[PDB]
Design a protein around this ligand. Structure first.
Ligand SMILES: Cc1cc2nc3c(=O)[nH]c(=O)nc-3n(C[C@H](O)[C@H](O)[C@H](O)COP(=O)(O)OP(=O)(O)OC[C@H]3O[C@@H](n4cnc5c(N)ncnc54)[C@H](O)[C@@H]3O)c2cc1C
Ligand SMILES: Cc1cc2nc3c(=O)[nH]c(=O)nc-3n(C[C@H](O)[C@H](O)[C@H](O)COP(=O)(O)O)c2cc1C
Ligand SMILES: Nc1ncnc2c1ncn2[C@@H]1O[C@H](CO)[C@@H](O)[C@H]1OP(=O)(O)O
Length: 608
């Protein structure tokens, strides 16, 4: 646990704030929403601040009533399996244990979730319920943002009704403002300029453990090979050297990496704006009291900022386009940008089709609305931060303690915007050549793990890149057998298009099967025949034996890969197996499978 800042209420008093917005964020979405709401306060005769709950003791909520017409808002995303984001875990544990009386506290919650997940918006729902139980009063309805539809629009809709409700309750009423000031640095020592590191200046050059999110370890890429035969896609296997990093990991964990944006994209942004990207500068918070001195590590050059610190590839959110509208000299273009933030009508329709569906990134917008010429410093203040990307470690630390393996598909597709979009992290990783290519990384512990007992049967289901954590699982189960331990059945249900085209790790898997590390190697080749053959079809085929393992053997089920359709289709097949052999009705079978999840016998590692 980090050292907590002093009372946030006392800070609000000293700064004249009456609204504080906390963010439970893993990948920065909730963080940006909280900042937007904090800034909105100003437009309604109020003053707010955004804050990371992990840096404070939320028990001070009981003192919030000491400030007249005060309000606290929580923008909380859910993560893992219906769990709090890492930065909100402390707050979550407090909520569960405390008995503090929050009479007088006024609150509102906007939850960020995804309906395709088992526990939709669990964190937002919990915080909203809990604050009321503790005696606080809800000032506005709980917002349920759904990233499976369009989260940005859900926030827009909620926000548009939130402020009027707040104004009406507190009896308050409704130009561009900058949060940072530009300071150019002439003749500055190169030793004080950030060049891409995340935390402490020169932390990338002078590596000192422990290594984590704020201090990533630069791991040498010792291997990077194409796993598939065709040319339609690029599937790759990479091996990262973590020797001497003191980093520990287990099969099932994830490795996070900090990539660099495409240099050509960065160059073009500077070029179209007519800005010198090599100018060394700092963007300093006009609020000298704030803990957030800069939008990203400063001093640094715009080129470095656009390359390592800012997201320049995802579709800009509406507030960014709204603030940029002032720099568009063509009326129709200024209007289009202005209306992107609309909660209905053609403005909303245009945002959804022209920006989101077409996947237009910032450069694309600057190109298609050529009158839009914002100053580079303001643009850097508006763009969100570049996030680390997570990969399921494809190796076992029992076999490869000094190496972390990655199995990924390179992202590259034709967007409706007319250009070819490239995945930031995958394009960057793909270009890493062994012999010294370094990847800034860190390990995040997951709850995806092999059984504690070697004798417990394992059922692994992971088609495509979903096979990633299982290569580690199999390496380990094979190692255990080699160590003379008694290992239960180890079944793999894998899937790809064709055996001679994209059968990932075919050679390695054949080996494990031949040696007995893999009890069964069930592979569904989806395109070797007219009808689709998927992993769930093989599960249904083996329903009798799978039931025996689940019902009598206490087997652990693992599902990895596509969370859009495969995960649910597989889950549905398990519902059918349980229903037939229980026997029991569908409803009961569903409850049965969900109970397996709660007992740690049905684990997921699904994304996108
Ligand atoms: C816990 C976890 C584990 C993961 N494990 C792995 C893993 O082991 N292997 C792996 O390959 N990935 C895995 N990922 C995904 C990985 O983290 C990245 O999201 C992925 O590699 C893409 O990153 P990128 O930076 O290359 O692409 P980005 O620049 O982040 O672009 C990604 C976005 O591109 C858009 N997009 C992609 N294709 C299209 C399309 N055809 N049409 C329109 N839009 C599209 C989508 O919005 C997608 O979100 C995992 C993710 C999580 C969260
Ligand atoms: C590994 C992972 C697990 C997730 N688990 C859940 C979940 O259990 N429930 C839910 O509603 N959303 C879940 N989501 C979706 C996020 O809550 C949603 O994308 C949110 O917008 C992320 O906000 P952030 O960028 O502020 O963390 C998950 C996303 C990832 C990547
Ligand atoms: N909904 C689904 N359930 C299980 N596998 C799926 C799936 N959708 C696609 N797949 C298969 O997952 C593997 C990796 O993408 C491919 O064989 C793909 O087959 P397809 O692409 O031929 O449909």
């Amino acid at each position: 646990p980090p050292v907590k800042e002093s009372s946030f209420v006392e800070k609000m008093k000293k700064t004249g704030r009456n609204i504080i917005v906390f963010y439970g964020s893993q990948t920065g979405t909730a963080e940006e929403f909280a900042n937007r709401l904090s800034k909105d306060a100003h437009r309604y005769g109020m003053r707010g601040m955004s804050a990371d709950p992990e840096e404070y003791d939320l028990a001070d909520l009981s003192s919030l009533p000491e400030i007249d017409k005060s309000l606290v808002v929580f923008c909380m995303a859910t993560y893992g399996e219906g769990d709090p984001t890492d930065n909100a875990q402390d707050f979550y544990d407090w909520l569960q244990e405390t008995d503090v009386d929050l009479t007088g506290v006024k609150f509102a919650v906007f939850g960020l979730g995804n309906k395709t997940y088992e526990h939709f918006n669990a964190m937002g729902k919990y915080v909203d319920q809990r604050l009321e139980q503790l005696g606080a009063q809800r000032i506005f309805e709980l917002g349920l943002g759904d990233d499976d539809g369009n989260l940005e629009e859900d926030f827009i809709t909620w926000r548009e009704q939130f402020w009027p409700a707040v104004c009406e309750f507190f009896g308050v009423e409704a130009s561009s403002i900058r949060q940072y000031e530009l300071v150019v640095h002439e003749d500055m020592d190169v030793a004080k300029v950030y060049t891409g590191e995340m935390g402490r200046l020169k932390s990338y050059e002078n590596q000192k453990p422990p290594f984590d999110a704020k201090n990533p370890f630069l791991a040498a890429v010792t291997a990077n090979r194409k796993l598939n035969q065709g040319t339609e896609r690029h599937l790759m296997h990479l091996e990262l050297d973590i020797s001497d990093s003191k980093i520990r990991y287990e099969s099932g964990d994830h490795v996070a990496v900090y990539p660099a944006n495409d240099s050509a994209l960065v160059n073009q942004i500077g070029e179209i704006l007519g800005a010198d990207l090599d100018v060394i500068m700092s963007l300093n918070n006009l609020d000298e009291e704030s803990n957030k001195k800069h939008p990203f590590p400063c001093p640094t050059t715009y080129r470095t900022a656009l390359t390592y610190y800012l997201d320049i590839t995802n579709p800009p959110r509406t507030n960014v386009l709204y603030e940029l509208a002032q720099y568009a000299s063509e009326p129709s273009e200024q209007e289009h940008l202005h209306k992107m933030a609309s909660s209905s009508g053609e403005g909303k329709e245009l945002y959804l089709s022209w920006v989101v569906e077409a996947r237009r990134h910032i450069l694309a917008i600057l190109q298609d609305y050529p009158s839009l010429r914002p100053p580079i410093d303001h643009l850097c203040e508006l763009l969100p931060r570049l996030q680390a990307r997570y990969y399921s470690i494809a190796s076992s630390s029992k076999v490869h303690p000094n190496s972390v393996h990655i199995c990924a598909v390179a992202v590259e597709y034709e967007a409706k915007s007319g250009r070819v979009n490239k995945g930031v992290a995958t394009s960057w990783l793909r270009a890493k050549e062994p012999a010294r290519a370094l990847v800034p990384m860190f390990v995040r512990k997951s709850q995806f793990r092999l059984p504690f007992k070697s004798t417990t049967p394992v059922i692994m289901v992971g088609p495509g890149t979903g096979i990633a954590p299982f290569m580690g699982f199999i390496q380990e189960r094979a190692w255990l057998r080699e160590q003379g331990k008694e290992v239960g059945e180890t079944l793999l249900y894998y899937g790809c298009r064709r055996s001679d085209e994209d059968y990932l790790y075919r050679e390695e898997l054949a080996r494990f099967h031949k040696d007995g590390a893999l009890t069964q190697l069930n592979v569904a080749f989806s395109r070797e025949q007219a009808h689709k053959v998927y992993v769930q079809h093989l599960l249904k085929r083996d329903r009798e034996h799978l039931w025996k393992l689940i019902h009598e053997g206490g087997a652990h089920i693992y599902v990895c890969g596509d969370a859009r359709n495969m995960a649910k289709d597989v889950q549905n097949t398990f519902y059918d197996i349980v229903a037939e052999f229980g026997p029991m009705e569908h409803t009961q079978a569903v409850d049965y499978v969900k109970k397996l999840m709660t007992k740690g016998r049905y684990s997921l590692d699904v994304w996108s």
